[PDB]
Symmetry: D2
Amino acid sequence: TLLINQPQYAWLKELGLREENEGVYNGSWGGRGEVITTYCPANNEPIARVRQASVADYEETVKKAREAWKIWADIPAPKRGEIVRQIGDALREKIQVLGSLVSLEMGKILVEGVGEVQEYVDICDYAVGLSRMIGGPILPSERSGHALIEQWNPVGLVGIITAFNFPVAVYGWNNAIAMICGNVCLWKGAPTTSLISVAVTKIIAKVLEDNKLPGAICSLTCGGADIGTAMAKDERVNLLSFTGSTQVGKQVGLMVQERFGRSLLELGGNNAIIAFEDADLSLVVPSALFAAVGTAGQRCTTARRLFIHESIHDEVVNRLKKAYAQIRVGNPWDPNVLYGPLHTKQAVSMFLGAVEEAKKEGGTVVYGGKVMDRPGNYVEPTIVTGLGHDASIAHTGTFAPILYVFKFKNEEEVFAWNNEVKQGLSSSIFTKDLGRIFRWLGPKGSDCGIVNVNIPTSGAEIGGAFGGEKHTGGGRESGSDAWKQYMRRSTCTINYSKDLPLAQGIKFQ
Amino acid sequence: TLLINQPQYAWLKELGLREENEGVYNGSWGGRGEVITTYCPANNEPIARVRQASVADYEETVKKAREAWKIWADIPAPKRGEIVRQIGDALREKIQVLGSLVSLEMGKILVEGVGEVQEYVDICDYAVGLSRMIGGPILPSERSGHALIEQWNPVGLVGIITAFNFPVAVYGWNNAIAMICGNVCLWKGAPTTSLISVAVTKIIAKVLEDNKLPGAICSLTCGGADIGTAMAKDERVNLLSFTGSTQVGKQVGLMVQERFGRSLLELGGNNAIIAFEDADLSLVVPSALFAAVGTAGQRCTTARRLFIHESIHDEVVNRLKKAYAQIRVGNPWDPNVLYGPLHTKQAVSMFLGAVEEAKKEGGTVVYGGKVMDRPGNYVEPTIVTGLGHDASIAHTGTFAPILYVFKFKNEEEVFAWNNEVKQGLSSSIFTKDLGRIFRWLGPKGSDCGIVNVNIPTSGAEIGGAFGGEKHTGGGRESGSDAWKQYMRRSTCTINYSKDLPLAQGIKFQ
Amino acid sequence: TLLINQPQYAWLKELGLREENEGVYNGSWGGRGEVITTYCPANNEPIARVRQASVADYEETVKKAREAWKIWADIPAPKRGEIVRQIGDALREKIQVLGSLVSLEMGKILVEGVGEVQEYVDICDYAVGLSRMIGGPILPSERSGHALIEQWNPVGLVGIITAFNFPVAVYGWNNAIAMICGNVCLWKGAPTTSLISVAVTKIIAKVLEDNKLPGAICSLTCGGADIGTAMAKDERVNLLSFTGSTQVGKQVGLMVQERFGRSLLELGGNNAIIAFEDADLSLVVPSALFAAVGTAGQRCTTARRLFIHESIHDEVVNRLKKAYAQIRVGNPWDPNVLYGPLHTKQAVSMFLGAVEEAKKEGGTVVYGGKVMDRPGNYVEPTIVTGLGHDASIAHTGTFAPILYVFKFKNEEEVFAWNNEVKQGLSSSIFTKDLGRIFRWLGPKGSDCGIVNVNIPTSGAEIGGAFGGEKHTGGGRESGSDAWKQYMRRSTCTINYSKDLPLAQGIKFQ
Amino acid sequence: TLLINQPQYAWLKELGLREENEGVYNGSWGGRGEVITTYCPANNEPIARVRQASVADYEETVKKAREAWKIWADIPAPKRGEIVRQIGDALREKIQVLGSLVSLEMGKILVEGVGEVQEYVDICDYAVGLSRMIGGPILPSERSGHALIEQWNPVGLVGIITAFNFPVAVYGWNNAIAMICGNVCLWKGAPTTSLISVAVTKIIAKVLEDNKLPGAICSLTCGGADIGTAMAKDERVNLLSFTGSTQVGKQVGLMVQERFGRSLLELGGNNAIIAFEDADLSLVVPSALFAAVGTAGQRCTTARRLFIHESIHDEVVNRLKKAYAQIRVGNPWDPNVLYGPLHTKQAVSMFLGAVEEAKKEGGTVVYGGKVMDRPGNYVEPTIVTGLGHDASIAHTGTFAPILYVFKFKNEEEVFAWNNEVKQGLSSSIFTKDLGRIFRWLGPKGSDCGIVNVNIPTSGAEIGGAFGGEKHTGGGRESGSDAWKQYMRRSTCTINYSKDLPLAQGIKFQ
């Protein structure tokens, strides 16, 4: 019955996966919690099983992780980069089979499953050089005979909670950066992508053990809300990096603040594309389509709100409808497929609720809107017109492939409409107007963490920091100086002079 | 009866103070809230009155500040720096009379009151140059025909809540930095330093008004917990900088997190000096004394825990006793005075409670411990020996001039003893050992935000970032890249090429 | 006969100038060299006299500056910034009378003379904050128990040779930055602006003396080529900043390279404005005029080559002619005057030589070309059309107010024509095309040190580094990290561990 | 007779080396110049031959390299980093045989031959991340509606001349950095390491060819002074990096300055180790030996001057003598060998002349001083005592393993003695004194480019910039922001507003 027991999926064994897999790694493999079976969202068939972490597994893992940190924090950062460099190579050696697992267990198409593994590889190669660069300035002290230096040190144990939709890359950004910064890591991925978490951890565990390093440096405790909540409340998790929904992320943020911990929050987006009258429409339509239906609309950066100037609204909507009609739906591993299943059956149900609610709020479905009658969690990519920019279903957002299209007339109102939602991840304008572009980049422009021009809302590379504002949580991952979130700053004054302080009337000896 | 009506305090009128003063400024002065009288702690006499903010005052002020932000955010940062430079000069012209007000209403000695105003002047002079430098890198994009830029923009309204012990400088750090970053400010100072808040605001308002700028750029709403709590809950307050107690800061931090706002928390310290056997005692003893008794022990960075190696414990304590007996006590504006009153009568009672509590935990008062027989809130600077480092009064502690002395033997235990308290603001070792110094600065060393060598726990200048870790709250002020907390980062990809996305098998028009 | 003895120029005495002035300052004032009389180019009247430096004056000044450096380099950089802050204020208090001297002795119009002093004022305020920021990173060593830090220290004595056309700002840029970096300075200005050099030095000398500092920190030795050549060959001159002609700068660079000194070269520019077809002509025409005729065409960044697309060439040229006809010529201090005299009588002769040579080389003078029949060195601002882009008089380029206008058709040829001259200082395109704008800024765009869009060739502020490439010499002044040219970098590894090296088979003791 | 034709050296063929090799690579292999035979300095046996570049070869190669630059500069820097990463892997794969070739042709021992290749590997891995970081800041303009950006673009063609002693690493440092910065390279190695140059170039060429890139991006023209001189005078060589003698580097710098090109000069060192009385002798003695005799004393960073405090001079010298006697001499590829031959017989004659001159100048040879009676260019590592610190042979300095030992008493004089030589590369103090250490790093300390503490003069890693001051030439390679020497800075102002310049009275259309 299990896909891994069928000969056509024998490649799963290339990742060291078997029928039932240990979901706890801390130098040793184990798992005394509930045994979870994950299913292929393309056909609802069970893949294989993972033994999740019990409470005792978590406790023992946190303790071993903190013990491992004593060794890890003493290793010079450039030599930690060498370990990350070898992780990058180990992922490279398995990039095809690992991407296939992503397409199989998570459900995105092969080029994106592979693309996600590549993203992890790239942040490793980036981190190798960064491991020779992290630090702070020596500043000129105002005091004679004094040195003033800014030092950066690891926070210690970095808990990393990741979500289903990017079950490799998000962890990889957190892991590569946290590691070169001298932290040990504890990963709790999404339960429905447990095999992916196990397969990644198996790849990292081999690198650590080959270098005779304690495996708890990159610990794994598979589990659900119970393990994630424990991490949020655990004073031993110095930094908790959380990627997931705003609702859960809000509670995580509060629990970490309650104990004066650090949180790095990467939550939802309600991302807008704005097409102005002067836009290259041959650029708008494909950019809008791919940003909306890519990954079955399940990216944090998915385009969910399409603002079109009134003069070109009907043309762009008509051109999208005809282009939507050609989206090729199928099994995500089939090479010609552009559009795969939603991750869960619950997501299918939420999609239907959103479509029907959008109809109740006055919207018109001009394309899609129905569940597809076929095995798996397939729904039609959908376009909804006629809603006001402030319609409730547009503000709350769903994680469904539904593109809400709005009209606008002038720049000032649509910048505000971009900014009026609670989320603040990504944003894009399509225009040729030089001044409009820089106003968009300015203080009266987009309020998001990613502010794009003539590229859709999913345009981001590892060189920059990734994250958003407002209800997106404020955290940043990957590039620029995002590494400082994984370290603690100290401002250090060293008196190296023989100067004694002024006595101020006091007679010392 | 009011000091401002007595001819010997006529200099107060040089700050624009009157018998009853308006405690709300938003371009206009007002205040419909409760009228508070503030008192001089050196003689327990009332100084003058301040009309605090009502709820309606607060509402009107927030609205005016946000309206003013539209004007202020359009002013180029270098020109915002010119405004800050002129504030620097306006404070210069008033440094003596303003510092005298700090001594009178707060109670610290004159050189420290003047010194606090100098810090505001210095951070202004720093911000002038910074206003031509703030921003992010242009990064090399991996995509041909694309630019990748990291932009920084103001968050909007920066609420600034400050405490009694530094009623000028903490505001000044936030104000100077937030202003050049294009933010408007809302100040709620400690109720018992209301005259200081008003006088500072009077100086800034003239500069703003002299430059034909809306005064709400630097708003003031005098008030207590009710106004501060409103700021913590106010979604219109984009950044809340809070300086105060750990108990309050924790609730403030939770409230800001509840609404996905930004907070900058500068909370309590329980700071330690560690003297190793090789230390220069002619440097340890004065450094310990001045760091312990300065500001009557009411600094966030006041030295509260003195660890002395067993070989020199008795000698260092004996040398401290002889030096403490020579501390000159008096009115804080008297120039010969090194030691002034505690800020309130309640603090005197708490001082007595702490001394009595230290005796209950097994401690020995080797110097001081009693209230002084004189008008005002004067208590003897006190030294306590014999407690274990894990004694309850040592780990929590009060805001009293009580120095707890401990013995230690080896380096690792005393580093851990430094780190074992909940707070993490400042820390100092005195030693000549080169390796011990770098280990202190390293990952197994001090866990504090300020990590000093051969200078006590109050060694800090504006060039570096100021703040602590753990229950100190994690915020940073003043130097390095602390300005990024007052701005929002965006990662911006600009497609300037004529290239189109790949069709991926779809026919576009 | 001297202007300083006439009552209408009595304001000169406000700068401490007299009939005959000492041109050597090294803590004391002197001058045993040749006495020079400087003349007002607006009427050819002599202004006053300056006693220049003899060899012995130079020898003594260098020795005292190097002695003073021992004191100056021990002063903390933020405290050096405080001195630079006071210099800015001392310049502020005299901005009007000093800017007037620039107009009288050099000949540019009053708002530009005043503006030049403001440039020095602004760089001082910038350097104040910079003096708390200069330094390098603490890097993570690959070796255990080692620290790796990059240190910056002053080079020592910075010789600053400046030119007539910016007789205040160029020195100021060098001075304020070299000073906060811990260097002493030796200034030799253009002989024909000796009074300006003396007047500036008097303002600085007062600030140094008021702060109880050796005056030689900002030394002055007025002189011509003989002193400049001595500075270029002087091993005691650690950095030579030379601003002037390409011909002279080339010999200075070679002499400094011969002795392994450091040089900072700010040489000629042959700057082009390029107007594309989609450009706002209501922006092109005023911008071109002001950048070409401003300062009577005697700026390093003066627009000398105007490339106009063939479609709009005749319209732009005709609008340029009609606009030149409204330029108001007069005494440079007289209000509403836009156009003053050339600096010298030789410059008039070179203007005439260039005009006739352009005619012989196939050019047509469509406006101006003649000396004006009036007192002073006034020549008509001139427009020459019809030359090929590679005309010899266009490539060499005099310092005369002649604007050479060319046609172009496509982007690639006109970028190449911008880059085809030996100089590489300033450059501008006027266009609305987003892609052209970024191609102009990229590796196939402008090759100059200043690359502007929709603003002329004189657009430059202190926040950025100022200087050019190719025959402009490569130096940078003012903003960004130009300060590193005034300091020496050291890469410092500190072994703080007790770890002994690997014995590698040797029996050590 | 040629070593490559003997079967024991068949491993040379693994690098693509044959009996006669092409010494020109520009996408094709050739060489019409004189054929040079290189010899093994351990036995003076011929290895193989290399056909060097004629003038026509050089011309053709520069032209193809400049054509290739048009393709190379358009490739996004991260993608250039991907090429550099593969060069690193390709070096990894050949590290043993290439290290053996370095030991065979140059004469250093195998671990250092492998170590030199490893250094190139490391700079590649460093440059991979750096290729996502190079760039400049976005600055806040003082003009509303304007952007201010600092751009960095390649210089174009980077000429790289390297020396015999580091025939891989120096090229690799320049190559990896120049490539990610968008430049093409032209390499002319030392004639006596021609096989190494060819072998390295073969490794790079395969990577470029596999990636369908023009091979002239990493061009090679083997030759001596004539080709090196051609590069120095060639306006087509935008940056000439020269590593070699001070005498030649001085002429190269002058030739480049004459044509207003860029040079990066890495010339000789005359480096000092200073042992204070408080130094750990168990650390001084091995450190001095390895820094003095490593690479048979042929590094730029070789310890040539050992200053010992009077109190410990005799003990250190005696401990140095006992350790020198254990230095194991042999063929540089022979296992466990610490000490190989000098590179040439001429170096042996210079060694002998220096020893006799040092004795004639009053020095005593306490160990070594003689040619070894065996095949190859073997001389005894030598220690000379009794000379004054300013003895003539100590200031000039050969490239021979002769360690000059001097006495000192006080810190200030021996600091001055470190600084008194013309060169200024590396320097080290061995001490435990905290204040002395910071004074050594400060403005009155070492004047060298590398300023070390308790680690000898060869302590340098790629994370920092490498190079010296004074007669060492001032260039920096490898770490920090050394990449900026391989790029040109532009300060770019973009007016994105519709604002027009002030009419200044002129009526425009």
